[PDB]
Design an enzyme around this catalytic site. Structure first.
Site, PDB file in Angstrom:
ATOM      1  N   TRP A 152       0.814  -1.206   0.000  1.00  0.00           N
ATOM      2  CA  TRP A 152       0.000   0.000   0.000  1.00  0.00           C
ATOM      3  C   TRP A 152       0.871   1.291   0.000  1.00  0.00           C
ATOM      4  O   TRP A 152       1.754   1.425  -0.883  1.00  0.00           O
ATOM      5  CB  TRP A 152      -1.088  -0.077   1.093  1.00  0.00           C
ATOM      6  CG  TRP A 152      -0.683  -0.275   2.549  1.00  0.00           C
ATOM      7  CD1 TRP A 152      -0.665   0.679   3.523  1.00  0.00           C
ATOM      8  CD2 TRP A 152      -0.302  -1.515   3.192  1.00  0.00           C
ATOM      9  NE1 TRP A 152      -0.284   0.123   4.709  1.00  0.00           N
ATOM     10  CE2 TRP A 152      -0.047  -1.220   4.539  1.00  0.00           C
ATOM     11  CE3 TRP A 152      -0.113  -2.839   2.742  1.00  0.00           C
ATOM     12  CZ2 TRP A 152       0.379  -2.196   5.461  1.00  0.00           C
ATOM     13  CZ3 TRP A 152       0.292  -3.820   3.672  1.00  0.00           C
ATOM     14  CH2 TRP A 152       0.536  -3.488   5.012  1.00  0.00           C
ATOM     15  N   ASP A 153       0.631   2.230   0.927  1.00  0.00           N
ATOM     16  CA  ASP A 153       1.331   3.519   0.961  1.00  0.00           C
ATOM     17  C   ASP A 153       2.766   3.349   0.562  1.00  0.00           C
ATOM     18  O   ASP A 153       3.481   2.609   1.215  1.00  0.00           O
ATOM     19  CB  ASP A 153       1.353   4.112   2.369  1.00  0.00           C
ATOM     20  CG  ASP A 153       0.027   4.572   2.863  1.00  0.00           C
ATOM     21  OD1 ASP A 153      -1.049   4.037   2.494  1.00  0.00           O
ATOM     22  OD2 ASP A 153       0.082   5.483   3.695  1.00  0.00           O
ATOM     23  N   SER A 173       3.749   5.161   7.440  1.00  0.00           N
ATOM     24  CA  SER A 173       4.262   5.942   6.317  1.00  0.00           C
ATOM     25  C   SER A 173       5.012   7.189   6.722  1.00  0.00           C
ATOM     26  O   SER A 173       4.856   7.690   7.807  1.00  0.00           O
ATOM     27  CB  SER A 173       3.125   6.312   5.368  1.00  0.00           C
ATOM     28  OG  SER A 173       2.401   5.136   5.059  1.00  0.00           O
ATOM     29  N   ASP A 211       2.782  10.064   8.878  1.00  0.00           N
ATOM     30  CA  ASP A 211       2.879  10.523   7.500  1.00  0.00           C
ATOM     31  C   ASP A 211       3.655  11.817   7.401  1.00  0.00           C
ATOM     32  O   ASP A 211       3.211  12.776   6.762  1.00  0.00           O
ATOM     33  CB  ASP A 211       1.493  10.656   6.878  1.00  0.00           C
ATOM     34  CG  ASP A 211       0.737   9.312   6.813  1.00  0.00           C
ATOM     35  OD1 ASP A 211       1.180   8.306   7.411  1.00  0.00           O
ATOM     36  OD2 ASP A 211      -0.324   9.269   6.134  1.00  0.00           O
ATOM     37  N   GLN A 217     -10.894  19.083  20.135  1.00  0.00           N
ATOM     38  CA  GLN A 217     -12.162  18.393  20.003  1.00  0.00           C
ATOM     39  C   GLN A 217     -13.019  18.651  21.243  1.00  0.00           C
ATOM     40  O   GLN A 217     -12.493  18.888  22.321  1.00  0.00           O
ATOM     41  CB  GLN A 217     -11.926  16.873  19.842  1.00  0.00           C
ATOM     42  CG  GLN A 217     -11.263  16.201  21.030  1.00  0.00           C
ATOM     43  CD  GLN A 217     -10.647  14.838  20.669  1.00  0.00           C
ATOM     44  OE1 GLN A 217     -10.384  14.553  19.516  1.00  0.00           O
ATOM     45  NE2 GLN A 217     -10.404  14.011  21.678  1.00  0.00           N
ATOM     46  N   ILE A 244      -7.345  12.834   8.059  1.00  0.00           N
ATOM     47  CA  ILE A 244      -6.838  13.352   6.791  1.00  0.00           C
ATOM     48  C   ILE A 244      -5.374  12.915   6.723  1.00  0.00           C
ATOM     49  O   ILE A 244      -4.593  13.245   7.606  1.00  0.00           O
ATOM     50  CB  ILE A 244      -6.998  14.882   6.708  1.00  0.00           C
ATOM     51  CG1 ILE A 244      -8.490  15.245   6.665  1.00  0.00           C
ATOM     52  CG2 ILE A 244      -6.282  15.483   5.490  1.00  0.00           C
ATOM     53  CD1 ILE A 244      -8.776  16.728   6.772  1.00  0.00           C
ATOM     54  N   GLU A 245      -5.015  12.189   5.655  1.00  0.00           N
ATOM     55  CA  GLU A 245      -3.772  11.424   5.595  1.00  0.00           C
ATOM     56  C   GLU A 245      -2.854  11.903   4.492  1.00  0.00           C
ATOM     57  O   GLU A 245      -3.277  12.687   3.637  1.00  0.00           O
ATOM     58  CB  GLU A 245      -4.088   9.928   5.393  1.00  0.00           C
ATOM     59  CG  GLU A 245      -5.043   9.351   6.438  1.00  0.00           C
ATOM     60  CD  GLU A 245      -5.127   7.821   6.430  1.00  0.00           C
ATOM     61  OE1 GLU A 245      -5.388   7.227   5.369  1.00  0.00           O
ATOM     62  OE2 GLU A 245      -4.944   7.205   7.495  1.00  0.00           O
ATOM     63  N   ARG A 303     -10.535   9.435   3.531  1.00  0.00           N
ATOM     64  CA  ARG A 303     -11.695   8.573   3.414  1.00  0.00           C
ATOM     65  C   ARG A 303     -12.771   9.424   4.061  1.00  0.00           C
ATOM     66  O   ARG A 303     -12.630   9.817   5.232  1.00  0.00           O
ATOM     67  CB  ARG A 303     -11.506   7.252   4.174  1.00  0.00           C
ATOM     68  CG  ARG A 303     -10.411   6.319   3.651  1.00  0.00           C
ATOM     69  CD  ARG A 303     -10.494   4.855   4.132  1.00  0.00           C
ATOM     70  NE  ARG A 303      -9.501   3.970   3.483  1.00  0.00           N
ATOM     71  CZ  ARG A 303      -9.626   3.390   2.269  1.00  0.00           C
ATOM     72  NH1 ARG A 303     -10.702   3.575   1.490  1.00  0.00           N
ATOM     73  NH2 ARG A 303      -8.652   2.606   1.796  1.00  0.00           N
ATOM     74  N   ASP A 355       4.557   3.681 -12.078  1.00  0.00           N
ATOM     75  CA  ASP A 355       5.377   4.704 -12.682  1.00  0.00           C
ATOM     76  C   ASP A 355       5.366   5.973 -11.786  1.00  0.00           C
ATOM     77  O   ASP A 355       4.319   6.591 -11.572  1.00  0.00           O
ATOM     78  CB  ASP A 355       4.866   5.035 -14.075  1.00  0.00           C
ATOM     79  CG  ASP A 355       5.919   5.737 -14.961  1.00  0.00           C
ATOM     80  OD1 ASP A 355       6.834   6.410 -14.435  1.00  0.00           O
ATOM     81  OD2 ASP A 355       5.792   5.613 -16.202  1.00  0.00           O
ATOM     82  N   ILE A 367       7.678   8.457 -12.553  1.00  0.00           N
ATOM     83  CA  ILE A 367       8.417   9.429 -13.365  1.00  0.00           C
ATOM     84  C   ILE A 367       7.731   9.625 -14.717  1.00  0.00           C
ATOM     85  O   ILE A 367       7.824   8.800 -15.617  1.00  0.00           O
ATOM     86  CB  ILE A 367       9.876   8.949 -13.593  1.00  0.00           C
ATOM     87  CG1 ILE A 367      10.595   8.744 -12.254  1.00  0.00           C
ATOM     88  CG2 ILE A 367      10.650   9.923 -14.492  1.00  0.00           C
ATOM     89  CD1 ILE A 367      11.890   7.966 -12.374  1.00  0.00           C
ATOM     90  N   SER A 417       6.427   7.512 -21.227  1.00  0.00           N
ATOM     91  CA  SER A 417       5.739   6.791 -20.150  1.00  0.00           C
ATOM     92  C   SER A 417       4.244   6.492 -20.383  1.00  0.00           C
ATOM     93  O   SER A 417       3.678   5.656 -19.689  1.00  0.00           O
ATOM     94  CB  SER A 417       5.884   7.540 -18.817  1.00  0.00           C
ATOM     95  OG  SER A 417       7.201   7.484 -18.320  1.00  0.00           O
TER      96      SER A 417
HETATM   97 CA   LIG Z   1       8.114   6.635 -16.355  1.00  0.00          CA
HETATM   98 CA   LIG Z   2     -10.235  13.470  17.497  1.00  0.00          CA
END
Ligand SMILES: [Ca+2]
Ligand SMILES: [Ca+2]
Length: 517
Positions: A94-95, A164, A247, A272, A345-346, A364, A482, A484, A489
């Site tokens: 994934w990430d 990540s 992240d 919050q 928010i990632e 998401r 890819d 780049i 490409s």
């Molecule tokens: Ca490329």
């Molecule tokens: Ca919270």
């Protein structure tokens, strides 16, 4: 019993005060009308609803292009010795992120290689670790990538995980990794910390090796004022609150200072709480919209609860001048926050284009408070993911939303299809001041798309950045994985339409509501 500020907005909204309930009046009377921004630019309740509505309309300017499902493969380098089991397995990947030039963000050329770092793990296991991969610089074949193995070695466990971050070249051509160290020893909580380490690689006859990992240390894990700390989260969590400290994206400005832009939640600067339901600033629509939104929130326990716990932030801090042992030099208020509106928010990411800074992030939308809006996205498309975006005249400056609401990319196929995508991550393109290449991972994790369908690298596609703070998805598409973009490409064979975006059987498959709800 209305007070006069409340009286004022009820009239402007075209609302007959005699139609209000005692509870409605009491709520409007608690409303705080302050206009002072406490925690940077906000994604307002109105922005969120607009992002969802745009996703629902499936507007060609913003929708993720359809991908030809039949062309899609598991990445061969994701079949590799697992960090935890020590056995060769086919892993979800994934990430992922390339090693980038710290200043320009371009995919770095390291002795004629491109380098990528990726989260992988065995489907349906708790197996979160990062791996180093390489290919020849400019090579366009998914299958030419090779996996060096887990950066933090074999015999790893779920007690200490890597999530990540980002990576760049140091002056001596070592790599400075930024990642998320996760300690799960306090009763399996995901206690997240921004960490860094230096990677020393060797190049031998087309074989890249990881010679040494040095200087591994925690950089930052929240302060309590700008950003929520683990202790704060733990003190009040009965199961409704997210925890985020991850992240980290490294970026160096014109003046030579390195910064980290990262995912978190607000601290006591603008925390919050149920009180956020009564901050007018958070709503961001006209009077009719804000009031309708207030009453909707108070009348649905799930929305009220979510609004009570929502405070996602995109944070920023400055680092000291030690490349190899970065430490916090200064903390700042968030660039973006979403009190009352979202708690996730990632992958925040900054791209310098011309004289401007573009701040992007993936989310998401079912992490948002507005159940109606994200449920309706689910019904329209079968998924609720998006990339949002903002622009400022300087790195630390005040960020303003693109395409009015912040919308940039919106989900186009169901979360459980092979061609579903997430973790949109834009990369600059050499010689272009008005395009980024959008990378992402494809196929959601843990076999939700079917037996053997591992999370893999999506085909990438260009996104145009217009000088009036709008964006336009372009029909230009690469092979899978890819990083780049160049003329060489483009691969028209990867382009899908609604029909070929699904493998046989997939159109007629029920939604997976555990995944998208
Ligand atoms: Ca490329
Ligand atoms: Ca919270």
């Amino acid at each position: 019993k209305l007070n006069k500020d409340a009286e004022n907005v009820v009239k402007k909204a075209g609302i007959d005060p005699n139609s209000l309930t005692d509870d409605q009046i009491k709520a409007l009377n608690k409303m705080n009308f302050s206009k002072a921004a406490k925690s940077g630019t906000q994604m307002t309740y109105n922005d969120f609803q607009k992002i969802a509505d745009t996703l629902i309309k499936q507007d060609g300017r913003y929708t993720v292009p359809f991908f030809k499902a039949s062309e899609i493969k598991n990445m061969p380098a994701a079949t590799t010795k697992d960090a935890q089991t020590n056995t060769i397995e086919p892993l979800d990947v994934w990430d992922s992120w390339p090693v980038q030039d710290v200043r320009t963000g371009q995919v770095a050329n390291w002795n004629g290689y491109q380098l990528v770092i990726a989260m992988m793990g065995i489907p349906n296991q708790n197996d979160n670790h990062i791996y180093l991969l390489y290919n020849k610089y400019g090579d366009n074949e998914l299958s030419h990538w090779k996996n060096v193995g887990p950066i933090f070695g074999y015999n790893s466990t779920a007690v200490s995980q890597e999530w990540s971050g980002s990576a760049v070249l140091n002056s001596d051509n070592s790599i400075q990794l930024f990642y998320t160290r996760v300690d799960t020893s306090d009763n399996n909580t995901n206690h997240q910390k921004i960490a860094s380490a230096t990677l020393y690689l060797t190049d031998n006859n087309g074989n890249v090796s990881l010679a040494q990992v040095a200087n591994d240390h925690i950089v930052f894990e929240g302060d309590g004022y700008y950003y929520q700390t683990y202790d704060q989260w733990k003190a009040t969590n009965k199961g409704a609150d997210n925890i985020a400290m991850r992240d980290a994206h490294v970026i160096e400005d014109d003046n030579g200072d390195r910064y980290l832009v990262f995912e978190a939640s607000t601290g006591l600067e603008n925390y919050q709480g149920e009180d956020q339901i009564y901050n007018w600033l958070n709503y961001g629509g006209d009077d009719a919209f804000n009031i309708k939104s207030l009453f909707r929130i108070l009348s649905n326990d799930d929305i009220k609860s979510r609004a009570t716990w929502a405070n996602a932030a995109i944070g920023i801090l400055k680092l000291n001048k030690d490349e190899k042992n970065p430490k916090v030099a200064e903390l700042y208020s968030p660039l973006i926050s979403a009190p009352m509106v979202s708690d996730e928010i990632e992958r925040p990411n900054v791209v310098k284009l011309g004289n401007k800074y573009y701040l992007f992030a993936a989310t998401r939308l079912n992490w948002g408070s507005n159940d109606d809006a994200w449920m309706n996205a689910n019904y329209a498309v079968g998924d609720n993911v998006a990339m949002v975006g903002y622009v400022a005249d300087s790195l630390t400056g005040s960020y303003k939303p693109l395409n009015d609401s912040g919308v940039v990319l919106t989900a186009s196929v169901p979360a459980n299809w092979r061609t579903a995508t997430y973790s949109y991550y834009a990369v600059p393109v050499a010689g272009k001041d008005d395009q980024v290449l959008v990378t992402s991972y494809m196929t959601n994790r843990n076999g939700v798309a079917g037996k053997g369908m591992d999370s893999t690298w999506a085909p990438s596609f260009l996104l145009q950045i217009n000088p009036d703070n709008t964006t336009t998805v372009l029909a230009k598409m690469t092979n899978q994985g890819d990083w780049i973009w160049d003329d060489s490409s483009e691969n028209l064979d990867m382009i899908g339409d609604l029909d070929s975006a699904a493998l046989p059987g997939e159109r007629d498959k029920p939604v997976d509501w555990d995944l998208i709800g």
